[PDB]
């Protein structure tokens, strides 16, 4: 039903709130180890899932993204191991700590957020990550996955609950039914704390319309960008384009725009660019500047913003770095932006100039999924300007509290006739 889930979440919050790290650490340890042994189960489950998906036949890249292979499995295992290793100081670690007056202390401890309602596209590999995140931050979690991996989702939840069997708190993680339950649950506020819809434009809007006294954070858009200039190895440019647009064609952070310094169009590098783009079979487009530049050129574009989410692209030429920054800040979505150059001056210039959630010099637009940032398992990427930037790791799921204990103080003791005066020194935290 509806409020039974809410009360189970509150019970999990109360339990994990009084569960010392000794419990949850071993909990995610067993989660990993059990994900290693019984993986054949979830393997065949996701096999059936992708089989029935292909039988339905939505779209080949989507079939690739909802797929699953032992490689990602071992990667998730070692990532959760890293989390468990470095999660002993999540809830309870002090951030600030001072001493205002004589015999009066003030600190700022971390604190669980409570109940989160995460929504996310099929992406069956995420469920273990997000569940490990909740179990490691000791906050109630509700789930909702795409109907595609439904069986795989249920299997993974069987896994995480057989893991929870060692701690007894069998409620902090749950599943839900179709979006009707999601609506009626988002309605019953005063029991939820955040909503993390991992990728939905219209559904970001819908949650907003249904966000009655409840915050929202996630990512609704991901238009990345790349750039090259007169001081970059052609080979590095080629292979970076390859890595960027040919690992997960349409996951979250695949670039869909190229930018070139006009003094490199004569260098025929555009030729090899299209050569490799066609060796991978990608229908490049172009916009105003290039579409004028060439004899008659590849076909025209519509809007430099439209995300395509498949083996497509767009190429424009820019007169100068200034135009590059203007173009990025005016068309991008501050998701993840790259460059390639040898002149370190232009490098730091572009780094400090652009504003995106990620900036990269001589690297790939693919390095943004938290895991490859050594952050361990994560929930998504944040485009917004509050509470996080980029991969929302653990620390993106924790807020602060001001506990303040004294002997006998008051407000007037600091007035004109008071007997104690401020110090405002920051003692070394424990
Ligand atoms: N930035 C990128 O590179 C990139 C790439 C691919 C996808 N994405 C994001 O992922 C989305 C793709 O669609 P999706 O089906 O895969 O999203 P989803 O995570 O599967 O969410 C379920 C879908 O049901 C629909 N709906 C109506 N009411 C809903 C409710 N209360 N709760 C949940 N869903 C409700 C939503 O819109 P629909 O009916 O239209 O699905 C929603 O997309 C896109 O909107 C996009 O934001 C981003």
Numbering used by the authors: 347 to 776
What does the report in the manuscript say about this coordinate set?
By focus refinement of the GPR dimer in the P5CSMix filament, we determined two additional states of the GPR domain. One is the NADP(H)-binding state, when NADP(H) is present at NBD. Upon NADP(H) binding, the residue R525 interacts with the adenine moiety. This interaction transforms the 525REE527 loop into an ordered structure that extends the α16 helix in the Rossmann-like fold. Meanwhile, the entire NBD rotates approximately 15° along the cylinder axis and slides towards CD. A similar phenomenon was also observed in ALDH1L1. This transformation contributes to bringing the nicotinamide ring of the NADP(H) close to the catalytic residue C598 of CD. Conformational changes triggered by the binding of NADPH subsequently initiate the transfer of the hydride ion from NADPH to the intermediate G5P. In our models, unliganded, G5P-binding and NADP(H)-released states represent as open conformation, and the NADP(H)-binding state represents as closed conformation. However, in the closed conformation, when the nicotinamide ring of NADP(H) approaches the G5P-binding site, the substrate tunnel entrance may be blocked by NADP(H). Next, NADPH binds to the GPR domain, triggering the conformational change into closed conformation, which brings the NADPH towards the catalytic residue C598 and facilitates the reaction.
The bifunctional enzyme Δ1-pyrroline-5-carboxylate synthase (P5CS) is vital to the synthesis of proline and ornithine, playing an essential role in human health and agriculture. The P5CS molecule contains two domains, GK and GPR, catalyzing the first and second steps in the biosynthesis of proline from glutamate. The GK domain catalyzes glutamate phosphorylation, and the GPR domain catalyzes the NADPH-dependent reduction of γ-glutamyl phosphate (G5P) to glutamate-γ-semialdehyde (GSA). Our results describe the assembly mechanism of P5CS filaments, in which the GK domain forms tetramer and the GPR domain forms dimer structure, and both domains form specific interaction interfaces.
